[PDB]
Amino acid sequence: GSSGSSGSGYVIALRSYITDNCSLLSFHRGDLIKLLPVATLEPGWQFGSAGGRSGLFPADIVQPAAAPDFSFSKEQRSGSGPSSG
């Protein structure tokens, strides 16, 4: 039963994670890591791309960030104006 009609997933690197392997991912502080579609992952490990290379980076050095894309949507209504505190 799917509920989340829309789907998003963009995280930014908080610190530089230099790696000397292929399996892992190498990126610097700020390099946004696009969350790629994966079947199953581990409790703490993440899977995505940071431009051209793909690897597994820790979810303890990255933070979530709004998506660079914007999907049109109804114009929410502004605060009517509550009288009673």
CB atoms within 10 A of CB 69: 7
Joined tokens for residue 49: 């791309």
Q: What is the CATH number of the domain that holds 74?
A: 2.30.30.40
Residues 6+ apart with CB under 8 A from 25: 17, 19, 33, 48, 49, 50, 53, 54, 55, 56, 57
Residue 64 φ/ψ, nearest 5 degrees: -70, 145
Residue 63 class from Cβ within 10 Å (0-12 exposed, 13-18 middle, 19+ buried)?
exposed
Name the DSSP letter for residue 17.
B
Compute the radius of gyration of the chain from its Cα atoms: 18
Sheet with 10-13: strands ordered across: 54-58, 45-49, 32-35, 10-13, 62-64
Query: What was the elucidation method?
Result: NMR
DSSP 7: -
For residue 42, give its domain range.
Answer: 1-85
